[PDB]
Design a protein around this ligand. Structure first.
Ligand SMILES: *[C@@H]1O[C@H](CO)[C@@H](O)[C@H](O)[C@H]1NC(C)=O
Length: 218
């Protein structure tokens, strides 16, 4: 179904589709989400139009999987995911990105953490991640530009693709393993709180169509 309410959600099987217009106050416009099918893989789209607050994210419309029981990164064997998506719109300044929070405390709220991992498959416009570039790295056979910074007490690692990766297959464990083995990330003590995929828009008009999305924690 469709809704434009700030915190609308639609649930089906193991997926939740959310409007999550948390930064609406920073600009003028709207955001709506439509959940098409949530049996097996997820199909949904996000629609929006925003002006003002040039460098402020307006929302993170997204799909995510349910994670009733939190587990440490090292305990998880694989975090496979596939994505098929395309953007349409005008003057788009937005990304297409996975977002995952982890914390040492398994009971931490699931909308923040000690760390945030982002994987940007798409990026339109001049925008960039929080923090500064740590150079390029190879993960799962694809090259990414790695960024690092702080959002309050939360450390944020964002891996950005070198082109718009509209058809993707990977394993998010490869990214956690890179941080564990190269940046001192304590995978043995951090629990995965969320596993989400969506878009952060700044300004413009756009529709993110997600034709297919899957993810799991195994
Ligand atoms: C997405 O495509 C546009 C134009 O082809 C480009 O400006 C932008 O950098 C691309 N994003 C990524 C992640 O490479």
């Amino acid at each position: 179904q469709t809704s434009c309410d700030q915190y609308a959600t639609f649930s089906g099987n193991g997926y939740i589709v959310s409007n999550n217009l948390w930064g609406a106050s920073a600009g003028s416009g709207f955001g709506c989400v439509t959940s098409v099918s949530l049996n097996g893989a997820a199909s949904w789209h996000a629609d929006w139009q925003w002006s003002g607050g040039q460098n402020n994210v307006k929302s993170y419309q997204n799909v995510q999987i349910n994670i009733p029981q939190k587990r440490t990164v090292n305990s998880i064997g694989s975090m496979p995911t596939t994505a098929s998506w395309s953007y349409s719109g005008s003057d788009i300044r937005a990304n297409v990105a996975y977002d995952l929070f982890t914390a040492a405390n398994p009971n931490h709220v699931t909308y923040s953490g000690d760390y945030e991992l982002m994987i940007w498959l798409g990026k339109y416009g001049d925008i960039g991640p929080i923090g500064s570039s740590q150079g390029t790295v190879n993960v799962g056979g694809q090259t990414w530009t790695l960024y690092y910074g702080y959002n309050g007490a939360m450390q944020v690692y964002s891996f950005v693709a070198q082109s718009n990766t509209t058809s993707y297959s990977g394993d998010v464990k490869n990214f956690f393993n890179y941080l564990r083995d190269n940046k001192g990330y304590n995978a043995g003590g951090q629990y995965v709180l969320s596993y989400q995929f969506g878009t952060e828009p700044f300004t413009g008009s756009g529709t993110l169509n997600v034709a297919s999305w899957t993810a799991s924690i195994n």
